[PDB]
């Protein structure tokens, strides 16, 4: 998900934020952490 603070291309930014969150999720151990990945 994103911030929900954008009026232009919000859903596009949300996708970009989702990628960032997934990367950070991996940086937090990813699947080895036991925590489900972000959506």
From Swiss-Prot:
Subcellular location field: Secreted
Tissue localization of expression: Expressed by the venom gland.
Sites bearing Serine amide, chain numbering: 39
Family: Belongs to the glucagon family.
Role this protein plays: Venom protein that mimics the incretin hormone glucagon-like peptide 1 (GLP-1). It stimulates insulin synthesis and secretion, protects against beta-cell apoptosis in response to different insults, and promotes beta-cell proliferation. It also promotes satiety, reduces food intake, reduces fat deposition, reduces body weight and inhibits gastric emptying. Interacts with GLP-1 receptor (GLP1R). Induces hypotension that is mediated by relaxation of cardiac smooth muscle.
Name this protein carries in UniProt: Exendin-4
Organism of derivation: Heloderma suspectum (Gila monster)
Section covered of the full-length record: 48 to 86 of 87
